[PDB]
């Protein structure tokens, strides 16, 4: 009665920085790896679905284990963290032959340094040269003063453990938002 699965068959996945968040309503659906907490994805019909908070990213193959609330890791520290009120799951699948080009794809970034703690779902767009010496760097490369971002370099020849994956994360806030299941009388 409504189209639901736009994000599963997506065309391209954005960078690991710009998150994509959509609001929808009154839709439901059913079913390489899948694992969630609230309820079985096939029997989930027995509960009230209220809020939709969708996102997706690209993560190297092996470190899919780091996407969970209250974990440790550089990628989690600099991109995304989750709170103690965890309600959701992480879905991913391998698309090496679909996302890797023989020449090599080198258009992705990450972060290495910070200055303080970060609240979940926070962004800093500034890319100014990083100073730690007493004498302030006025834009001199090196000497602890550099540029933060760095590429990734994926190829189809890369190994299975480090082959690219497409990452899907769905968050449903258990607020009083409307449901997506009903019937006759």
């Amino acid at each position: 009665l409504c189209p639901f699965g736009e994000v599963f068959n997506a065309t391209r996945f954005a960078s690991v920085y710009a998150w994509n968040r959509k609001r929808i309503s009154n839709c439901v659906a059913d079913y390489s790896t899948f694992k969630c907490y609230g309820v079985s994805p096939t029997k989930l019909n027995d509960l009230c679905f209220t809020n939709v908070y969708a996102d997706s990213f690209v993560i190297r193959g092996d470190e899919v284990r780091q996407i969970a609330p209250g974990q440790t890791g550089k990628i989690a520290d600099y991109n995304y963290k989750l709170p103690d009120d965890f309600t959701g799951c992480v879905i991913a699948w391998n698309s090496n032959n679909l996302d890797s080009k023989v020449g090599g794809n080198y258009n992705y970034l990450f972060r290495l340094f910070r200055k303080s703690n970060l609240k979940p779902f926070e962004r800093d767009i500034s890319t100014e040269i990083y100073q730690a010496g007493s004498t302030p760097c006025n834009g001199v490369e090196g000497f602890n003063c550099y540029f933060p971002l760095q590429s990734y370099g994926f190829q189809p020849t890369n190994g299975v453990g480090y082959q690219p994956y497409r990452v899907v994360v769905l968050s449903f806030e258990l607020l009083h938002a409307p449901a997506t299941v009903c019937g006759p009388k």
Partner: protein
């Protein structure tokens, strides 16, 4: 406001950066030795140019400002390697002679040729003319003229790098900003540190007598065991009771001693086994050998390989104008890319090499979780030295016992064990003795106080002492044969004895002890054993986080080196060899010509 985190990022960014350069150089190298075209003949100098720029600039960055106040020796050593470098500071006019004597060897070797005495122009390279005589025919003059042709028209063009070296080069390394370079060419193991133990290296060399009192009087018995059993080798010219010959030593540069042993034949007829024809006769097939030699070490609690490796490793020989070195190499492409190339041909060499290759490609992922600066096992010497002992384990009928048609009690009959398959004792150690003065040559010419009465005179006294070589036409001390070693420009190791030599000593003090046999590897179980998996697959991963002595100890139980693996495993023929002959005349007997 601390220097630790100030200097750490400098290490981390380049540790993240170097992966792309390493990967690109790997594909370039593979493309070249697989596809040899004029477009590909030059890959290294252009692919590693960026790597060399990175290395040099970061070396000048880290060198000029040191890291005095750091409190973690593991990290200090880890950044020390790329902290210190050089070889690009000295003046060209004087450093050019040094790099010339180092490098110009390869050019003359590439333009060299050795040929027949009656082949003026049309003739072929060195190897095929002389390497087949001992195994095929009996022709004397062709082998006899070898050293004369060498010394007259093949070894004479190693002099332009010769005459200056032995005359002047001993002292002119004073501007090398180090103690010396022989310490790094044959001594890059002398390192002293902290955290519980201070470790040394000279105990791995000074124990010659200690560790081979049991093998030292072996020439003194073989000198008569030749007449005892090896008579069928060569009569009518070789002295029966005199000295061992030295004008027919066997080869040109004295590498191995395996070209003179297999000449005792008491019988000719036998239903032997062979990879050429007997491969598939007795309930065997050639296609599933790769699957079953996997099963034997994967059914122990490991999962199997995907089809990616299967389609990446094609099973056809090059054959055509496109050709690769049919010798298979465990390609360390990195980034979880492990690949091997081979030729379609069944041989026992092929089986042993394939076994070593799958051992490599299986143990490699144990440390796969570590970042770039730890991409190797405990020691690369083992990764290429254990091929021999795995081949030895493979060459035994445990396979026939495991497939279950010929029962294991079908031991070889008595008259079948004496012919061909009981000579393996000194094949490894027959090349050891003549390397000590070569190893110490720089170690005692670095001083510069040495006089000219001793250049390398010790050779002849060592032969008189242990071996009994009576020197023909002299390649004497004036003719510095060690200075003319062939692999000088190929930067292969000569650091311990030749390569992966002395690190093999103390590790096997308890290998089969853990593999639970009272004695040797014979009847020691490796297959279907639960203890083998937890004895190897979890501990075969060290990294740079812990010193190599901890990895050694966790296997052996002792820090010092011993020789207990040299146990009664070799007894069944030592009981034939070393009891009787302690009376006969060995070596020099004053009945022949010494100078000739």
């Amino acid at each position: 406001s601390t220097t630790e985190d100030l200097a750490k990022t400098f290490l981390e960014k380049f540790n993240y950066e170097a992966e792309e350069l390493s990967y690109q150089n790997s594909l370039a190298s593979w493309n070249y030795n697989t596809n040899i075209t004029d477009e590909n003949i030059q890959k290294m100098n252009i692919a590693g140019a960026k790597w060399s720029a990175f290395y040099e600039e970061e070396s000048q960055h880290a060198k000029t400002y040191p890291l005095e106040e750091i409190q973690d020796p593991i990290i200090k050593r880890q950044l020390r390697a790329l902290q210190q470098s050089g070889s690009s500071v000295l003046s060209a006019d004087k450093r050019e002679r040094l790099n010339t004597i180092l490098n110009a060897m390869s050019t003359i070797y590439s333009t060299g040729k050795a040929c027949n005495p009656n082949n003026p122009q049309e003739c072929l390279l060195l190897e095929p003319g002389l390497d087949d005589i001992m195994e095929n025919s009996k022709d004397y003059n062709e082998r006899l003229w070898a050293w004369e042709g060498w010394r007259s028209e093949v070894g004479k063009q190693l002099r332009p790098l010769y005459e200056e070296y032995v005359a002047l080069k001993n002292e002119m390394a004073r501007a090398n900003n180090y103690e010396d370079y022989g310490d790094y060419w044959r001594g890059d193991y002398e390192e002293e540190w902290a955290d519980g133990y201070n470790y040394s290296r000279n105990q791995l060399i000074e124990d010659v007598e200690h560790t081979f009192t049991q093998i030292k009087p072996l020439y003194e018995h073989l000198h008569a065991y030749v007449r005892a059993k090896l008579m069928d080798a060569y009569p009518s010219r070789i002295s029966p009771t005199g000295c061992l010959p030295a004008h027919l030593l066997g080869d040109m540069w004295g590498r191995f001693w395996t070209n003179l042993y297999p000449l005792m034949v008491p019988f000719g007829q036998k239903p032997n086994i062979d990879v050429t024809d007997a491969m598939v006769n007795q309930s065997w097939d050639a296609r599933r050998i790769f699957k079953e030699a996997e099963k034997f070490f994967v059914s122990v609690g490991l999962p199997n390989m995907t089809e990616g490796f299967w389609q990446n490793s094609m099973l056809t020989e090059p054959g055509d104008n496109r050709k690769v070195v049919c010798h298979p190499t465990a390609w360390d492409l990195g980034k979880h890319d492990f690949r091997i190339k081979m030729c379609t041909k069944v041989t026992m060499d092929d089986f042993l090499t394939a076994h070593h290759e799958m051992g490599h490609i299986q143990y490699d992922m144990a440390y796969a979780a570590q970042p770039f600066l730890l991409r190797n096992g405990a020691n690369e010497g083992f990764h290429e030295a254990v091929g021999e002992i795995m081949s030895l384990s493979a060459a035994t009928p445990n396979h026939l016992k495991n497939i279950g048609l010929l029962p294991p009690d079908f031991s070889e009959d008595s008259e079948t064990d004496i012919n061909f398959l009981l000579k393996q004792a000194l094949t490894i150690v027959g090349t050891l003795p003549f390397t000590y003065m070569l190893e110490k040559w720089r170690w005692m010419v670095f001083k510069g106080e040495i006089p000219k009465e001793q250049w390398m005179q010790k050779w002849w006294e060592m032969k008189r002492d242990i071996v009994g070589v009576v020197e023909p036409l002299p390649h004497d001390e004036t003719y510095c044969d060690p200075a003319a070693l062939f692999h000088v420009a190929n930067d292969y190791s000569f650091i311990r004895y030749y390569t992966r030599t002395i690190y093999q000593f103390q590790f096997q003090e308890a290998l089969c002890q853990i593999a639970k046999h009272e004695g040797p590897l014979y009847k020691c179980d490796i297959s279907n054993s639960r203890e083998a998996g937890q004895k190897l697959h979890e501990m075969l991963s060290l990294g740079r986080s812990k010193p190599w002595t901890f990895a050694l100890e966790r296997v052996v139980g002792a820090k010092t080196m011993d020789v207990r693996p040299l146990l009664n495993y070799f007894e069944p023929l030592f009981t034939w060899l070393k009891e009787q002959n302690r009376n006969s005349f060995v070596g020099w007997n004053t009945d022949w010509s010494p100078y000739a």
